[PDB]
Amino acid sequence: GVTVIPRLLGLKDEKKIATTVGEARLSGINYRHPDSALVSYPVAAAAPLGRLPAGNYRIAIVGGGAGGIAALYELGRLAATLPAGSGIDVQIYEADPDSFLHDRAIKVRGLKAGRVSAALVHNGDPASGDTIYEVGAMRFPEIAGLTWHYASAAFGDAAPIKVFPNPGKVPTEFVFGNRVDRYVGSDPKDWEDPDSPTLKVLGVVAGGLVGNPQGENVAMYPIANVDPAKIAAILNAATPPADALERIQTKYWPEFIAQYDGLTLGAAVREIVTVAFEKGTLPPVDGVLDVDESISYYVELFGRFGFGTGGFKPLYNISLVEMMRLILWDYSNEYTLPVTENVEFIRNLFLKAQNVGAGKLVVQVRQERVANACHSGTASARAQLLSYDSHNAVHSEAYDFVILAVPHDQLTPIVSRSGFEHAASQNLGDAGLGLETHTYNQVYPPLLLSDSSPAANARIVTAIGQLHMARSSKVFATVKTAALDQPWVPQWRGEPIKAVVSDSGLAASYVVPSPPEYSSLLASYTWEDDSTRLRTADGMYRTMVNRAYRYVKYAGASNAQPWWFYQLLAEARTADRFVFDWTTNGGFKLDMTGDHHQSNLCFRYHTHALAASLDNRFFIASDSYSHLGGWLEGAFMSALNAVAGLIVRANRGDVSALSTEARPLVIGLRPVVK
Amino acid sequence: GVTVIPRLLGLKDEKKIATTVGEARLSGINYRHPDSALVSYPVAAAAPLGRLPAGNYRIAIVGGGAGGIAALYELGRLAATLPAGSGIDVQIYEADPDSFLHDRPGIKAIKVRGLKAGRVSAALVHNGGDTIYEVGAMRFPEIAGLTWHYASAAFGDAAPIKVFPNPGKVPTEFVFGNRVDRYVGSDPKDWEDPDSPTLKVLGVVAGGLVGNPQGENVAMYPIANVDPAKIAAILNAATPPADALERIQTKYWPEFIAQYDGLTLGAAVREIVTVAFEKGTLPPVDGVLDVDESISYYVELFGRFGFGTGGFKPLYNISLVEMMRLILWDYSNEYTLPVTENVEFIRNLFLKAQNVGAGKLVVQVRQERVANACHSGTASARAQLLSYDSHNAVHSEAYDFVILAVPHDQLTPIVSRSGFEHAASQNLGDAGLGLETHTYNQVYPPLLLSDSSPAANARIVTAIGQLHMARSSKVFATVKTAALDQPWVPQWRGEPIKAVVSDSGLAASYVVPSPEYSSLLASYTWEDDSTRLRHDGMYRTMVNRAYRYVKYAGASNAQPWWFYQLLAEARTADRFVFDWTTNGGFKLDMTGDHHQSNLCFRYHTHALAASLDNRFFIASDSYSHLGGWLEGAFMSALNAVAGLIVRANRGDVSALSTEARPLVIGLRPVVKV
Ligand SMILES: Cc1cc2nc3c(=O)[nH]c(=O)nc-3n(C[C@H](O)[C@H](O)[C@H](O)COP(=O)(O)OP(=O)(O)OC[C@H]3O[C@@H](n4cnc5c(N)ncnc54)[C@H](O)[C@@H]3O)c2cc1C
Ligand SMILES: Cc1cc2nc3c(=O)[nH]c(=O)nc-3n(C[C@H](O)[C@H](O)[C@H](O)COP(=O)(O)OP(=O)(O)OC[C@H]3O[C@@H](n4cnc5c(N)ncnc54)[C@H](O)[C@@H]3O)c2cc1C
Question: DSSP characters for B145-205?
Answer: HHHHHHHHHHH-TT-B-EE---BTTB-EEEEETTEEEEESSS-GGGBSSTT-HHHHHHHHH
Q: Is the CB of A82 under 6 A from ligand 1?
A: no
Tell me which residue of A624, A607, A625 sits closest to A616, measured CA to CA.
A607
End-to-end CA distance of chain B: 36
Closest in A469, A551, A593 to B417, CB measured: A551
This structure's resolution (Å) is 1.7
Residues 6 or more apart in contact with residue A290 via CB below 8 angstroms: none
Measured between alpha carbons, how far is B513 from B49 in angstroms, rounded to an integer?
A: 37
* Helix, strand, coil percentages in chain B from 3-state DSSP, rounded to 5: 35, 20, 40
Measured between alpha carbons, how far is A235 from A36 in angstroms, rounded to an integer?
A: 10
Measured between alpha carbons, how far is A386 from A408 in angstroms, rounded to an integer?
A: 18
Tell me the CA distances in angstroms from A669 to A254, A305, A603, B288, one per residue in order.
12, 36, 9, 18
- B343-356 vs B66-79: helix crossing angle, rounded to 10: 20
Closest in B288, B417, B581 to A453, CB measured: B288
- Find out whether B541 and A432 touch, Cβ atoms under 8 Å: yes
Are A405 and A438 in a shared domain? Answer: yes
Q: Which ligand is nearest to the CA of A587?
A: 1
**Which chain A residues are closer than 8 Å to B466 by Cβ?**
300, 303, 313, 529
DSSP state of A294: H
- Find out whether B318 and B263 touch, Cβ atoms under 8 Å: no
Biggest CA-to-CA distance, chain B: 84
Q: Is the CB of B630 under 6 A from ligand 2?
A: yes
Q: State how beta strands A87-93 and A56-62 pair.
A: parallel
Alpha helices in A512-583 (DSSP H): 537-548, 564-570
Total domain count for chain A?
Answer: 2
DSSP state of B332: S
CB contact under 8 A, A549 and B466: no
- Find out whether A281 and A220 touch, Cβ atoms under 8 Å: no
Q: What DSSP string runs through B538-582?
A: HHHHHHHHH--EEPPSSSPPPEE-HHHHHHHHS-GGG-EEE-TTT
Q: Is the CB of A642 under 6 A from ligand 1?
A: no
- Find out whether B131 and B124 touch, Cβ atoms under 8 Å: yes
Ligand 2, residues B115, B135, B406, B624: which to mutate, most atoms within 8 A of Cβ? B406
Domain-terminating residue out of B550, B583, B616: B583
Is B592 part of the contact surface with chain A (CB cutoff 8 Å)? Answer: yes
Q: Is the CB of B165 under 6 A from ligand 2?
A: no
Closest in B300, B468, B568 to A432, CB measured: B568
Q: Is the CB of A50 under 6 A from ligand 1?
A: no
- Find out whether B464 and B412 touch, Cβ atoms under 8 Å: yes
Q: Calculate the CA B570 to chain-centre distance.
A: 30
Q: Calculate the CA A359 to chain-centre distance.
A: 33
Tell me which residue of B510, B404, B488 sits closest to B133, measured CA to CA.
B510
Helix (H, G, I), strand (E, B) or coil at A198: helix
- B228-235 vs B320-328: helix crossing angle, rounded to 10: 50
Is A283 part of the contact surface with chain B (CB cutoff 8 Å)? Answer: no
Chain B nearest-CA residue for A583:
B581
Tell me which residue of A362, A390, A475, A335 sits closest to A80, measured CA to CA.
A362
Is A611 part of the contact surface with chain B (CB cutoff 8 Å)? Answer: no
Measured between alpha carbons, how far is B79 from B360 in angstroms, rounded to an integer?
A: 5
Helix (H, G, I), strand (E, B) or coil at B396: strand
Measured between alpha carbons, how far is A357 from A360 in angstroms, rounded to an integer?
A: 5
Tell me which residue of A361, A349, A350 sits closest to A82, measured CA to CA.
A361
Q: How many degrees, rounded to 5, is the angle at CA B10 between CA B8 and CA B12? A: 160
Tell me phi and psi for residue A635, to 5 degrees.
Answer: -55, -45
Are B269 and B258 in a shared domain? Answer: yes
Report the number of secondary-structure helices (H) and strands (E) in chain A: 19, 25
Tell me which residue of B341, B396, B312, B364 sits closest to B138, measured CA to CA.
B341
Residue B524 assigned as binding residue = yes
Q: Is the CB of A48 under 6 A from ligand 1?
A: no
Measured between alpha carbons, how far is B306 from B2 in angstroms, rounded to an integer?
A: 11
Residues 6 or more apart in contact with residue B373 via CB below 8 angstroms: B62, B383, B384, B385, B386, B402, B404, B414, B415, B446, B616
Are A596 and A575 in a shared domain? Answer: no
Closest in A432, A456, A583 to B544, CB measured: A432
Beta bridge partners of B160: B20
Q: Give me the count of residues in chain B.
A: 673
Are A557 and A457 in a shared domain? Answer: no
Residues 6 or more apart in contact with residue A527 via CB below 8 angstroms: A2, A314, A315, A470, A471, A472, A507
Alpha helices in A187-280 (DSSP H): 197-209, 228-235, 244-247, 253-260, 265-279
Chain B nearest-CA residue for A543:
B433
CATH number of the domain where residue A292 is located:
3.90.660.60
**Which chain B residues are closer than 8 Å to A299 by Cβ?**
592, 595
Q: How was this structure determined?
A: X-ray
Tell me which residue of B620, B543, B564 sits closest to B587, measured CA to CA.
B620
E strand or H helix at B231, and its extent? Answer: helix B228-235
Chain B nearest-CA residue for A593:
B267
Cα atoms in the 13 Å half-sphere on the side-chain side of A399: 29
Are B152 and B14 in a shared domain? Answer: yes
Q: Calculate the CA B214 to chain-centre distance.
A: 29
- Find out whether A398 and A382 touch, Cβ atoms under 8 Å: yes
Measured between alpha carbons, how far is A600 from A461 in angstroms, rounded to an integer?
A: 13
User: How many C-beta atoms lie closer than 10 Å to residue A279's C-beta?
Assistant: 9
Closest in B271, B533, B547 to A417, CB measured: B547
Work out the burial of residue A381: count CB atoms within 10 Å of its CB; fewer than 13 is exposed, 13-18 middle, 19 or more buried.
middle
> Which of A275, A414, A473, A549 is the mutation pick for testing B, counting most B CBs within 10 A?
A549
- Find out whether B466 and A530 touch, Cβ atoms under 8 Å: no
* Helix, strand, coil percentages in chain A from 3-state DSSP, rounded to 5: 35, 20, 45
Tell me which residue of B175, B167, B172 sits closest to B551, measured CA to CA.
B175
Q: State how beta strands A172-176 and A469-480 pair.
A: unpaired
Tell me the CA distances in angstroms from A268 to A202, A220, A320, A529, B47, one per residue in order.
14, 9, 7, 19, 46
Are A158 and A212 in a shared domain? Answer: no
Instruction: Say which amino acid occupies B547.
Output: Y
Beta strands in A414-537 (DSSP E): 423-428, 438-444, 469-480, 499-502, 507-512, 518-527
Tell me the CA distances in angstroms from A413 to A233, A464, A608, A627, one per residue in order.
42, 11, 21, 23
Q: State how beta strands A87-93 and A361-366 pair.
A: parallel
CB contact under 8 A, A264 and B266: no
Q: Is the CB of A93 under 6 A from ligand 1?
A: yes
Tell me the CA distances in angstroms from B292 to A594, B15, B60, one per residue in order.
12, 42, 57
Cα atoms in the 13 Å half-sphere on the side-chain side of A432: 26
Are A364 and A479 in a shared domain? Answer: no
Q: Is the dihedral of CA B231, B235, B241, B242 positive or negative?
A: positive
Measured between alpha carbons, how far is A243 from A245 in angstroms, rounded to an integer?
A: 5
E strand or H helix at A396, and its extent? Answer: strand A394-399
Residue B80 assigned as binding residue = no
Tell me phi and psi for residue B588, to 5 degrees.
Answer: -145, 120
Q: Is the CB of A346 under 6 A from ligand 1?
A: no
Are B284 and B394 in a shared domain? Answer: no
**Which chain A residues are closer than 8 Å to B450 by Cβ?**
288
**Which chain B residues are closer than 8 Å to A434 by Cβ?**
540
Are B131 and B274 in a shared domain? Answer: no
Tell me the CA distances in angstroms from A515 to A163, A438, B352, one per residue in order.
10, 48, 65
Instruction: Say which amino acid occupies A428.
Output: L
Nearest CA to ligand 2 atom 2: B136
Q: Is the CB of B366 under 6 A from ligand 2?
A: no
- Find out whether B59 and B647 touch, Cβ atoms under 8 Å: no
Determine the distance separating the centroid of ligand 2 and the alpha carbon of B570, expressed in angstroms: 30
What range does the domain containing B437 cover? 1-165+333-467+584-673
User: How many C-beta atoms lie closer than 10 Å to residue A73's C-beta?
Assistant: 27
Closest in B459, B535, B548 to A410, CB measured: B535
Measured between alpha carbons, how far is A508 from B283 in angstroms, rounded to an integer?
A: 50
Q: Rounded to 10 degrees, what is the CA torsion of A121, A124, A129, A134?
A: -20
Which 184-213 residues of chain A touch chain B by CB within 8 A? none
Q: What DSSP string runs through A22-81?
A: HHHHHHTTT---GGGTT--HHHHTTS-SB---SSEEEEEEE--SHHHHHHHHHHHHHHTT
Order across the sheet with A334-336: list the strands.
A140-141, A334-336, A162-163
Q: Which ligand is nearest to the CA of B309?
A: 2
Tell me which residue of B45, B147, B30 sits closest to B640, measured CA to CA.
B45
User: How many C-beta atoms lie closer than 10 Å to residue B378's C-beta?
Assistant: 7
Are A343 and A315 in a shared domain? Answer: no
Instruction: Say which amino acid occupies B457.
Output: N
Are B624 and B661 in a shared domain? Answer: yes
- Find out whether A614 and A649 touch, Cβ atoms under 8 Å: no
Beta bridge partners of A401: A59
Are B607 and B576 in a shared domain? Answer: no
E strand or H helix at A352, and its extent? Answer: helix A343-356
Measured between alpha carbons, how far is B329 from B5 in angstroms, rounded to an integer?
A: 9
Which 396-435 residues of chain B touch chain A by CB within 8 A? 409, 412-413, 416-421, 423-427, 430-434
Measured between alpha carbons, how far is A15 from A332 in angstroms, rounded to an integer?
A: 11
- A632-650 vs A145-155: helix crossing angle, rounded to 10: 80
Measured between alpha carbons, how far is B271 from A251 in angstroms, rounded to an integer?
A: 20
Q: Which ligand is nearest to the CA of A626?
A: 1
CB contact under 8 A, A466 and B595: no
CB contact under 8 A, A417 and B450: no
Q: Give me the count of residues in chain A.
A: 674
Q: Is the CB of B87 under 6 A from ligand 2?
A: no
CB contact under 8 A, A468 and B534: no
Domain-terminating residue out of B583, B618, B646: B583
- Find out whether A463 and A601 touch, Cβ atoms under 8 Å: yes
E strand or H helix at B401, and its extent? Answer: strand B401-404
Domain-terminating residue out of B527, B552, B583: B583
Rg, chain A, Cα only: 26
- Find out whether A8 and A638 touch, Cβ atoms under 8 Å: no
CATH number of the domain where residue A606 is located:
3.50.50.60
End-to-end CA distance of chain A: 35
